[PDB]
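Key idea: predict the complex, not the pieces.
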Amino acid sequence: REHWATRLGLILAMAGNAVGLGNFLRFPVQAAENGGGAFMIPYIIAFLLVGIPLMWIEWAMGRYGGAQGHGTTPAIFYLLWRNRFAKILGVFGLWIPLVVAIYYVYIESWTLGFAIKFLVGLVPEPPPTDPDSILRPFKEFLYSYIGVPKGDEPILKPSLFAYIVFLITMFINVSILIRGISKGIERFAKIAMPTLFILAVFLVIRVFLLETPNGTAADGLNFLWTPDFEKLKDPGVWIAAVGQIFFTLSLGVGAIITYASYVRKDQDIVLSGLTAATLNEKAEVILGGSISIPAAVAFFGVANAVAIAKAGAFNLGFITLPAIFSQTAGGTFLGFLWFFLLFFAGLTSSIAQMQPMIAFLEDELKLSRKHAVLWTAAIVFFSAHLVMFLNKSLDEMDFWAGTIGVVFFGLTELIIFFWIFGADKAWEEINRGGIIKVPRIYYYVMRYITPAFLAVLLVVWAREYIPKIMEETHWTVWITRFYIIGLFLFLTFLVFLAERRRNHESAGT
Ligand SMILES: CCCCCCCCO[C@@H]1O[C@H](CO)[C@@H](O)[C@H](O)[C@H]1O
Ligand SMILES: CCCCCCCCO[C@@H]1O[C@H](CO)[C@@H](O)[C@H](O)[C@H]1O
Ligand SMILES: CCCCCCCCO[C@@H]1O[C@H](CO)[C@@H](O)[C@H](O)[C@H]1O
Ligand SMILES: N[C@@H](Cc1c[nH]c2ccccc12)C(=O)O
Ligand code: NA
Ligand code: NA
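Result:
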């Protein structure tokens, strides 16, 4: 069974896992829609009571399960909890990361398509100066790439270039994954993370130099880092902060677990985990938070920046930022550094999203890595056509897989590992072989605070958001729900087959 060759490589893979589009696209938007500093306070609390505790749990389970020749939650849950239901609950450990990949890798291919276009300088050019007049050419640039429907029909019509770029993006993903953990994920991680960090730092440094009558990037930084206690009372920001912490650290997806299942039985996870997490957070709060927002505040001011943030998840990064850059010296090339950055950020994450599926086919169905990778790619590529052609389908998958799903699963694995499997055995399995030990206080957070914190949160989310689901929405949302539900059924079947092959290979040996 493959292992991480070096400690550094492991850290970088785990950090490349968490450091993605969420750091440079999602965080700024989330931080802005919530008043900046108002969002930061709950964000810090979430990182301590949730982000970190659960972080160690997933490493513990990954390494615990990895020892016994398993890298996925269906099998691992069964080990921590010998029950047929524990295997069915573990199916999400394959479903969630697989669903996320379906739309994530597509957004990833965008950054690749923009990077290329920007490199060759095949971009729009606004005349020298109205915000709408300069932004419009960029909106039209994105809407033409992904093929936003002009007509009432909710149908997307992506360009030939966009479609092929997706093929390439998938191909690049496969080329890395087909090499395995050390030769592939780890090898690429070492080169990708440093590069990423360099690009980010350069962009942050370059962004600061932005200066206009409307303001400066210095103002924007004061907006996000200004603590406001008035908004603290609202649950909206708490749910936003905790949802972001989950997405950024990649928790409740089962991806961290698969990666960690390649860590050696006694090898440290306490420090290793802590570090990789800290790397993501440092990159998110410092690097990701200093580019998008400060640039918009500079060129547009705060109020209008928040307006742009609330406008869309891609508006800031795919339209505004490139437009803001097109006004600066060497903006187009700077746009290429931006999208190239994103592409490496997403690529290190998309490979981690497909690894659980790859690990399952290998560990449980005894498929060669070559076959495990090609079929997984085939499933992701095929499934992605829904996201590419069916308007709003992307939104749907992100809500269930990357939003509601990851929290439900976070509480599940936490309960199984600590409550069912035993709180003390979990503690040993976590601290065992740890270069350092987990603070005794976190023992109580894990067993009591985190699950209660999550439980209450989920209920609150259910009380206000549940009415919305199926109450009123376009019927096309069912096309996505129908498919992703079928995805779960298909994954349940494989689990069923994996348990049956296990039975024959027991009597025959
Ligand atoms: C490569 C796999 C076979 C093609 C999958 C069938 C659907 C893709 O269809 C393709 O969509 C593109 C974007 O709309 C168009 O530009 C292409 O002309 C069209 O062939
Ligand atoms: C890394 C670059 C990938 C190859 C780029 C191929 C996509 C561009 O293809 C172009 O698409 C246009 C719109 O459909 C057509 O008008 C052109 O005839 C066609 O060459
Ligand atoms: C919804 C998931 C499946 C989407 C696949 C759509 C395949 C595209 O379908 C074809 O696209 C052509 C453009 O290249 C159009 O000219 C044709 O009219 C259309 O049949
Ligand atoms: N964590 C990545 C994106 C992501 C979300 N869930 C994941 C699950 C597995 C791998 C990556 C992810 C980011 O910060 O942008
Ligand atoms: Na990444
Ligand atoms: Na992240």
